[PDB]
């Protein structure tokens, strides 16, 4: 359950700009495969489907701990490692 924050200003550009940390939860990569978008209109439906928001998936349901799928990807890991070590 995601939120639109920007409308792209170019008619030629037709690509959903998704955050990198979202890749692991989707179990997907930038191979060009198409993702499906279903807009949610009703406010009650918004509060009901908010359980699929990234915040609710931050807590890994197996261990009750932080989900590593929403943590840093390997490139971000390289950056942070260079910075701190």
């Amino acid at each position: 359950y995601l939120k639109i924050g920007l409308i792209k200003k170019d008619y030629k550009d037709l690509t959903l700009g998704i955050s990198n940390n979202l890749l692991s939860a989707l179990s997907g990569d930038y191979d060009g495969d198409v993702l499906n978008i279903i807009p949610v209109f009703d406010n009650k439906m918004k509060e009901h489907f908010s359980l699929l928001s990234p915040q609710n998936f931050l807590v890994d349901r197996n261990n009750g701990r932080f989900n590593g799928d929403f943590d840093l990807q390997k490139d971000q890991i390289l950056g942070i490692f260079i910075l701190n070590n």
Binding site: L78, F81, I82, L83, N84
Partner: protein, 631 residues
């Protein structure tokens, strides 16, 4: 850099954001100004960056010495204390150099603020900000892969060049397991050289990102033996590395492996959806109720064997009965439970028909009560299993097993790869006519026990692996190498020219997908289910999960197994009685078909037999489901 920073004062001050940005700007500008120098040797060059310089941090009145980059990362990770205006606590601190601990911090954060929605928002904010700064570090401090890096490291360290130019000795005979051990030794040495010297690839291998030991070792050193499409180990190994070159035979082996990978992917695309569909359809209706005690009998709580550490890891936020007789939480860190069998309140023994109680699910209830439980369980089981299957078969690997050929065989014969060679080309090999049996997969004749006569002595040999005789000797077997009086084949080794193999054998490696397949079989084949009871199926499930490496908590697996079983009474209250009620465990397909829910059975499989025949007792089904609303 100001040498001293007060952590709690920066966190409480409203100038926190601009201070973070100023530190970030200073670090990135200093990195852009300077250039990295690689010694490519054991000694490390004098590269002075702003991130490497140390600073003193004042936290709760104590001084901790950390780096400047550690400071800016700590400020990013300390957003909750600026949001809530609460002082930074020294227990909420860790080694910012070790990345693996970061997750732990986050977890503690979730526990420290009571799993508030606001603390979750702050975690997401910290992740976003840290990612942006990671991108900045990556663009300013570049990352690059090139061949000249390895070439220069080999220039400085000759051992690296020797390993990169390594070739397995074709002068002397080598068995498959020795080849595998050679690959492992040389690859470990390569990784050690990469970690112990200042090369351009040091950050990759030390960060664990961008370097896989097996693939990178295939690139640098020998590739090794590769399997066939049918899972049989191909005899001729790939001596040269991909960078060094390849041969036409090696190219054929490589293309065959690639075709195997594509075929595997194609078939798993079809299998995964079916498996996950069955399990999800069964576990969709699992529920939870807020009742502390369901009345389940303490004797009815099933038992589990704490055989190893992983089995103890499966049970977290799980209850167990002490020797006083009182229910008490399980602490995973305690090793006193190992080597013991413990009876635990289990979801499979819950006596509430409305839903699982707080006791049988555990303390995790409050965490997972927002979402559907059975769906969480089925997803947690189905994602790693399918991903592991696909990745394991896509990563073509050889698992050669050591063979004890025997004293007679080893002293009178010589084995090299898949080839059997006579030490001396004299004497005669006698083989009994009946012992030339037929192998099913080979569709050709094989001999397992043969006797060789040399001089006055007659030796008898039995081969651990089936042996295919050489083609030239087999061609003349019936014409001139058979004695009808004795009903035995006598083959003179004198006829065989030197360097010609006496026989050949095939070897099948132990694929990495066997425990995962056993998981799937236990769920579907019903072989283990019919003979065994719940206490042993849960242990088999946990043991197979450890064998496969899948990390899923045993509570979800217990739910998966619970939904498969059907009570003969079909009433949960019977679990409140003294002894376990009558039940029968079924396979995943039969569970919902033989179940009591109309919607999950009609919308699943075998609509024809359900509507036409009463074999599934479909007309008697009256139980409700959420899936009923879709009808």
């Amino acid at each position: 850099m100001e040498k001293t920073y007060n952590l709690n004062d920066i966190l409480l001050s409203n100038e926190y954001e601009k201070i973070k940005e100023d530190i970030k700007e200073e670090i990135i500008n200093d990195m852009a100004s300077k250039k990295v120098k690689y010694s490519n040797t054991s000694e490390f060059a004098k590269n002075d960056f702003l991130k490497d310089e140390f600073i003193d941090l004042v936290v709760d009145g104590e001084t901790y010495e950390i780096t400047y980059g550690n400071l800016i990362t700590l400020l990013i990770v300390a957003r909750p204390f600026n949001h809530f205006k609460v002082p930074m606590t020294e227990d909420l601190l860790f080694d910012l150099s070790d990345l693996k601990e970061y997750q732990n911090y986050y977890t503690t954060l979730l526990e420290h603020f009571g799993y508030s929605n606001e603390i979750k928002s702050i975690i997401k904010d910290v992740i976003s900000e840290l990612a942006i700064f990671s991108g900045d570090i990556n663009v300013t401090f570049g990352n690059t892969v090139s061949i000249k890096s390895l070439i220069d490291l080999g220039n400085k360290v000759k051992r690296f060049r020797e390993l990169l130019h390594y070739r397995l000795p074709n002068d002397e005979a080598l068995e498959f397991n020795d080849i595998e051990a050679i690959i492992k030794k040389n690859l470990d040495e390569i990784m050690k050289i990469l970690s112990e010297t200042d090369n351009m690839l040091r950050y990759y291998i030390d960060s664990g990102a961008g370097i896989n030991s097996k693939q990178f070792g295939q690139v640098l050193s020998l590739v090794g033996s590769k399997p066939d499409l049918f899972g049989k180990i191909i005899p001729y190994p790939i001596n040269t590395s991909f960078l060094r070159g390849l041969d036409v035979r090696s190219f054929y082996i490589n293309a065959l492996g690639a075709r195997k990978a594509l075929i595997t992917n194609y078939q798993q695309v079809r299998n995964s959806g079916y498996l996950t569909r069955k399990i999800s359809m069964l576990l969709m209706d699992t529920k939870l109720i807020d009742l502390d005690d369901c009345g389940s009998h303490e004797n009815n709580y099933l038992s589990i064997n704490v055989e190893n550490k992983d089995v103890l890891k499966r049970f977290s936020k799980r209850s167990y009965l002490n020797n006083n007789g009182e229910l008490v939480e399980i602490d995973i860190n305690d090793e006193s439970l190992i080597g013991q069998v413990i009876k635990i309140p289990s979801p499979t023994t819950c006596a509430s028909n409305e839903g699982v109680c707080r006791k049988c699910y555990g303390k995790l209830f409050d965490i997972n009560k927002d979402l559907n439980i059975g769906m969480i369980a089925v997803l947690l089981l189905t994602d790693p299993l399918t991903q592991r299957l696909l990745s394991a078969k896509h990563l073509l690997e050889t698992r050669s097993s050591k063979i004890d050929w025997g004293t007679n065989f080893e002293e009178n014969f010589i084995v090299n790869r898949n080839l059997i060679y006579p030490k001396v080309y004299n004497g005669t090999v006698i083989i009994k006519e009946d012992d030339f049996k037929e192998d099913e997969e080979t569709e050709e004749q094989v001999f397992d026990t043969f006797t060789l006569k040399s001089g006055n002595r007659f030796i008898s040999i039995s081969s651990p692996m089936r042996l295919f005789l050489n083609k030239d000797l087999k061609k003349q077997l019936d014409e001139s190498f058979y004695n009808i009086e004795e009903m035995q084949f006598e083959i003179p080794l004198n006829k065989l020219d030197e360097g010609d193999s006496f026989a050949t054998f095939i070897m099948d490696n132990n694929e990495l997908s066997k425990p995962l397949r056993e998981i799937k079989d236990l769920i579907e084949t019903n072989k283990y289910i019919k003979d065994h009871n719940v206490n042993e199926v849960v242990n088999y499930f946990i043991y197979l999960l450890n064998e496969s490496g899948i990390n899923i908590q045993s509570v979800h697996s217990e739910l998966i197994i619970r939904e498969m079983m059907k009570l003969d009474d079909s009433d949960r209250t019977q679990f409140k009685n003294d002894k376990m009620p009558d039940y029968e465990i079924f396979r995943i397909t039969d569970a919902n078909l033989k179940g009591d829910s109309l919607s999950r059975s009609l919308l699943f499989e075998q609509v024809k037999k359900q509507l036409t025949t009463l074999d599934y007792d479909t007309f008697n089904k009256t139980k409700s489901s959420i899936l009923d609303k879709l009808l």
